[PDB]
Design a protein around this ligand. Structure first.
Ligand SMILES: *[C@@H]1O[C@H](CO)[C@@H](O[C@@H]2O[C@H](CO)[C@@H](O)[C@H](O)[C@H]2NC(C)=O)[C@H](O)[C@H]1NC(C)=O
Ligand SMILES: *[C@@H]1O[C@H](CO)[C@@H](O[C@@H]2O[C@H](CO)[C@@H](O)[C@H](O)[C@H]2NC(C)=O)[C@H](O)[C@H]1NC(C)=O
Ligand SMILES: *[C@@H]1O[C@H](CO)[C@@H](O)[C@H](O)[C@H]1NC(C)=O
Lengths: 49, 81
């Protein structure tokens, strides 16, 4: 698709170029108790902290 | 402009033995056609590189099975002894 994938830098290391990504969001909501929680889909907590 | 160096001081040129393409001296035909399965005569893209993909590119490529034109460079006449 003519997008940048790799780059041969001047230091001698090949690198992989990936687009900048954002974590998915899901919100579970309860109307009766008025309480909510968030879900970070398919990502561990060590990436959240 | 750019200086090309000194001109040639030789006032005499050298005689060449001209033979046409059907002079029984240059009609030895080794075909060597273009084979796309070996990627014969493929010019790489100028400022990009690709890895482990197959791509349909539009550009300037030779035809498959093209025999082309064969040119032979010979050695001039010289004395046996
Ligand atoms: C061989 O050819 C080169 C280029 O045709 C000559 O280099 C040029 O030399 C002249 C002086 O005679 C300079 O003014 C040019 O700038 C040179 N050009 C380049 C590209 O180098 C070279 O002199 C020739 N050598 C001999 C022995 O004939
Ligand atoms: C180059 O590409 C081929 C095909 O796209 C890759 O082969 C695949 O490898 C995975 C992982 O082993 C397999 O699950 C697939 O079945 C393979 N597909 C085919 C068609 O063989 C290959 O791994 C790639 N090589 C590199 C170094 O990235
Ligand atoms: C072109 O190359 C492939 C693989 O090297 C070979 O199998 C095929 O015979 C070649 N084509 C011809 C016309 O010889």
């Amino acid at each position: 698709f003519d997008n940048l994938i790799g780059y041969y830098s001047d230091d001698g290391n090949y690198y992989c170029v990936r687009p900048c990504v954002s974590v998915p969001l899901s919100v579970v909501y309860d109307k009766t108790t008025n309480s909510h929680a968030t879900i970070f889909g398919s990502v561990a907590c060590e990436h959240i902290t | 402009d750019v200086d090309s160096g000194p001109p040639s001081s030789a006032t005499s040129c050298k005689e060449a033995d001209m033979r046409n393409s059907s002079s029984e001296f240059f009609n030895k035909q080794w075909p060597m056609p273009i084979n796309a399965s070996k990627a014969d005569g493929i010019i790489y893209p100028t400022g990009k590189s690709y890895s482990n993909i197959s791509l349909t590119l539009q550009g300037l490529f030779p035809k498959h099975g093209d025999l082309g034109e064969q040119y032979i460079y010979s050695v001039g006449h010289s004395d046996s002894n």
